[PDB]
Swiss-Prot record, chain A:
One of its GO terms (biological process) is plasmid maintenance. The gene is ccdB. Homodimer. Forms a complex with GyrA, probably a tetramer GyrA(2)CcdB(2), in which GyrA is inactive. Forms a complex with toxin CcdB; the CcdA-CcdB(2) trimer is sufficient for rejuvenation, whereas maximal operon repression occurs with CcdA(2)CcdB(2). It comes from the Bacteria. GO terms for molecular function: DNA topoisomerase type II (double strand cut, ATP-hydrolyzing) inhibitor activity. It comes from Escherichia coli O157:H7. This is Toxin CcdB. InterPro entries: CcdB, Plasmid_toxin/cell-grow_inhib. The keyword Repressor applies. Toxic component of a type II toxin-antitoxin (TA) system, functioning in plasmid maintainence. Responsible for the post-segregational killing (PSK) of plasmid-free cells, also referred to as a plasmid addiction system. Half-life of over 2 hours. Interferes with the activity of DNA gyrase, inducing it to form a covalent GyrA-DNA complex that cannot be resolved, thus promoting breakage of plasmid and chromosomal DNA. Pfam families: CcdB. Belongs to the CcdB toxin family. The lineage of its organism: Bacteria, Pseudomonadati, Pseudomonadota, Gammaproteobacteria, Enterobacterales. Keywords: Plasmid, Repressor, Toxin-antitoxin system, Transcription, Transcription regulation.
UniProtKB/Swiss-Prot annotation, chain C:
Few gyrases are as efficient as E.coli at forming negative supercoils. Not all organisms have 2 type II topoisomerases; in organisms with a single type II topoisomerase this enzyme also has to decatenate newly replicated chromosomes. The gene is gyrA. Belongs to the type II topoisomerase GyrA/ParC subunit family. This is DNA gyrase subunit A. A type II topoisomerase that negatively supercoils closed circular double-stranded (ds) DNA in an ATP-dependent manner to modulate DNA topology and maintain chromosomes in an underwound state. Negative supercoiling favors strand separation, and DNA replication, transcription, recombination and repair, all of which involve strand separation. Also able to catalyze the interconversion of other topological isomers of dsDNA rings, including catenanes and knotted rings. Type II topoisomerases break and join 2 DNA strands simultaneously in an ATP-dependent manner. It is found in: Cytoplasm. The chain holds residues 363 to 494 of 875 of the full protein. Heterotetramer, composed of two GyrA and two GyrB chains. In the heterotetramer, GyrA contains the active site tyrosine that forms a transient covalent intermediate with DNA, while GyrB binds cofactors and catalyzes ATP hydrolysis.
Length: 95, 129, 127, 99
């Protein structure tokens, strides 16, 4: 589900960004999360919070993931939809 | 078959967003004015769900409804010749790109919407038999 | 020195597209009317470059934010703006939400920042 | 550059630079791999997975395979699909927005 963060099924974290009304038989579009700290456009790489923690949506590393590997929902970023969408738009449209 | 219901839910969900757009384009001038006066998208979004909109020449297209999601709450949708948008639909209208306002582009929306309306019906006929 | 020149090319180019959007917002009513009347994007795009637009003029100050490749037939030419086909595209790709107040300003702001950088990159060029 | 189709230099034979030319990533580049068209059925959405003619064969854009590519892997420019811009942008838009 779009804007929700999951983990995989084996031992780390990502946000599903694909539209819920577009169906991809077994795949799913994702933007992984990197630790925010380590990053010195904050608009192209939005920073999100999950628990008492903050991460960088590594937008340039976007990718498809087989739904079979997708673990538990850890959080829901639906309330950052605009930021997240703007980030995705900034990359293809540059605006 | 689950297979069928899965198909129904999928089309409903899909068409649900396409309606919002059909209604949004049935009254663009007031939508535009609403948006171009909202300080922020967030506010524009609130404004959008807040007040209902005239079912334009899409009124007859909507019209014994089953294109609505099994999960859609009663305070939403067509209720009294007026359409009440969900927060989700408002978003889709805010994400619209200007070029989708052209003539040929307006028609492709109305056409996919109509197709989904046809599939839905066929799907219920299957849940029927 | 190689870097500076690049940043200027990166800058001019970026600002080029942001100008067109600042002008597009400077006369949306007529742009909207033009687009919602074009049968297709492709046509709306032609209509857009076809006729010039009133300027953002004050801000639009400095003949250096324009691309070294920008034809002389484009840009500000007599108090009127002449859009490139590439800029018209950018305006067609705009999302309604970008019409909100706070959103309109974020454009003008970035545009102005670019014009600032382009300025110093030149002082640096000259000096 | 945006809308130009390159080669790797693998898995896929071709890829399309779909990233805005006004965004510096550096070393990276967002791309959409091109799969020989025959490899898919004419049933598949030409909306989400657009078709383009490049050279002497037809290709399918594996939109769902969208991925970043390290400039070091980018080979030589072999075509321009800028005249298919709105279709590519609807593929993309339709993926994150569904419309």
């Amino acid at each position: 589900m779009q804007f929700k963060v999951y983990t995989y099924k084996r031992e780390r974290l990502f946000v599903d960004v694909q539209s819920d009304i577009i169906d991809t038989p077994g795949r799913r579009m994702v933007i992984p999360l990197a630790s925010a700290r380590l990053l010195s456009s904050r608009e192209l790489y939005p920073v999100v919070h999950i628990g008492d923690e903050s991460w960088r949506m590594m937008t340039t590393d976007m990718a498809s993931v087989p739904v079979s590997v997708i673990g538990e929902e850890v959080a829901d970023l639906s309330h950052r939809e605009n930021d997240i969408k703007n980030a995705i738009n900034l990359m293809f449209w540059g605006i | 078959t689950r297979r069928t219901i899965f198909e129904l839910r999928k089309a409903r969900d899909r068409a649900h967003i396409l309606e919002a757009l059909a209604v949004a384009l049935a009254n663009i001038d007031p939508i535009i004015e609403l948006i171009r006066h909202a300080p922020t998208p967030a506010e524009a979004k609130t404004a959008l769900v807040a007040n209902p909109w005239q079912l334009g020449n899409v009124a007859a297209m909507l019209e014994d409804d089953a294109a609505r999601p099994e999960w859609l709450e009663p305070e939403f949708g067509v209720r009294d010749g007026l359409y009440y948008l969900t927060e989700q639909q408002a978003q889709a209208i805010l994400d619209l790109r200007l070029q989708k306002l052209t003539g040929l582009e307006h028609e492709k929306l109305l056409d996919e919407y109509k197709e989904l309306l046809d599939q839905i019906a066929e799907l219920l006929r299957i849940l029927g038999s």
